Amino acid sequence: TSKETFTHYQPQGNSDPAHTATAPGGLSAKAPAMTPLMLDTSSRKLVAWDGTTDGAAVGILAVAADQTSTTLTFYKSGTFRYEDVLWPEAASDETKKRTAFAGTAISIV
Amino acid sequence: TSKETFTHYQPQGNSDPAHTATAPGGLSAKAPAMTPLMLDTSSRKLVAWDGTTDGAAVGILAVAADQTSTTLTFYKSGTFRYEDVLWPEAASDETKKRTAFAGTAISIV
Amino acid sequence: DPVEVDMGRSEENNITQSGGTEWSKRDKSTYDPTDDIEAYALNASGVV
């Protein structure tokens, strides 16, 4: 009756090494891993990426955290998959979603 | 830390036999087995007991049925544990819920 | 209680002759059914 597919979790799509880094955060709502991140223009803390500002994307969340999480870890390097990364609903254009992490060590595939 | 525990289901209360009879079923909504039922007044049809009509209880469902199930079976006699029988929220008076099967081969325990 | 048993039959394994040229519209003297047989048998996932 029930049909559950046993699929492997594959966040990385490339052999390029991925590295974690710790930073202060200003997260406002609960966010799971693989969440895009950005710097608050005033407080200079880390929050979930809006999906609107161009180039504001900086990294991708490593471990899920709450508002009280003063320090959070995130991937500063590596290549990830366009489908295994959750996105803010604001980022609608496929090209913008693909190129949001341009110019840094975080890449999409 | 899921404390799912483990409790056996013993709907029977004593050595009284759980005889079953089958009658046409016309339940309006999806309901599981072991539900109380009453007899309608318009077409002498069978639906799950409302919990408000006094003395309306006639049968207790045996096998889970739904709207498409035109006919269903139900226990005729025995003793059923009050914690082991689900009830409509309409009936709240404990004494009335216990006495819902007065004069019938179905009894509460 | 009703229950379901879905072995996973892909629709390619339940072909039907539906269409305007099933088998009877074709002339028996002229047509060769073996082509239909092998066309149906190609997606069999094993030797039949």
DSSP string, chain C: ----------GGGS----STTSSSSS-TTT--HHHHHHHHHTTSSS--
Task: State this model's resolution in angstroms.
Answer: 4.1
Helical spans, DSSP H, in A1-109: 94-99
> Tokens representing B56?
């309306």
The Cα–Cα gap between A45 and C26 comes to 76
The Cα–Cα gap between A44 and A47 comes to 9
Q: Among candidates A37, A57, A55, A56, which has minimal Cα distance to A47?
A: A37
Which residues of chain C does A3 touch, with a Cβ-Cβ cutoff of 8 Å? 6
The Cα–Cα gap between A61 and A64 comes to 7
Q: What are the beta bridge partners of residue A74?
A: A21, A61
Which residues of chain B does C1 touch, with a Cβ-Cβ cutoff of 8 Å? 33, 63-65
User: Which chains form contacts with chain A, at 3 or more CB pairs under 8 Å?
Assistant: C
Which residues of chain C does B31 touch, with a Cβ-Cβ cutoff of 8 Å? none
Burial of B14 (0-12, 13-18, 19+ CB in 10 A): exposed
- Which whole-number Å values give the CA distances from B69 to B4, B59, B63, B65, B73, in the listed order? 32, 16, 11, 6, 11
Could you tell me which chain C residue has the CA closest to the CA of B73?
Answer: C1
Which domains can be identified in chain B, with CATH numbers?
A: 20-108 (2.40.300.10)
The Cα–Cα gap between C13 and C19 comes to 17
CB A100 within 8 A of CB A36: yes
C1 — contact with chain B (CB < 8 Å)?
Answer: yes
Chains A and B touch (3+ CB pairs under 8 A): no
A95 — contact with chain C (CB < 8 Å)?
Answer: no
Indicate left, alpha or beta for B78 from its phi (over 0: left) and psi (-120 to 50: alpha). left
Q: In residues, how long is chain B? A: 109
For chain A, the 3-state helix, strand and coil shares in percent, each to the nearest 5, are 5, 30, 65
User: Which chains form contacts with chain C, at 3 or more CB pairs under 8 Å?
Assistant: A, B
User: Which chains form contacts with chain B, at 3 or more CB pairs under 8 Å?
Assistant: C
Q: Would strands B106-108 and B78-80 be described as parallel, antiparallel, or unpaired?
A: parallel
Which residues of chain A does C5 touch, with a Cβ-Cβ cutoff of 8 Å? 1
A1 — contact with chain C (CB < 8 Å)?
Answer: yes
CB A1 within 8 A of CB C3: yes
C7 — contact with chain A (CB < 8 Å)?
Answer: no
Which residues of chain A does C6 touch, with a Cβ-Cβ cutoff of 8 Å? 1, 3
CA distance B62 to chain C (A): 10
Q: What is the CA A29 to chain-centroid distance, rounded?
A: 14
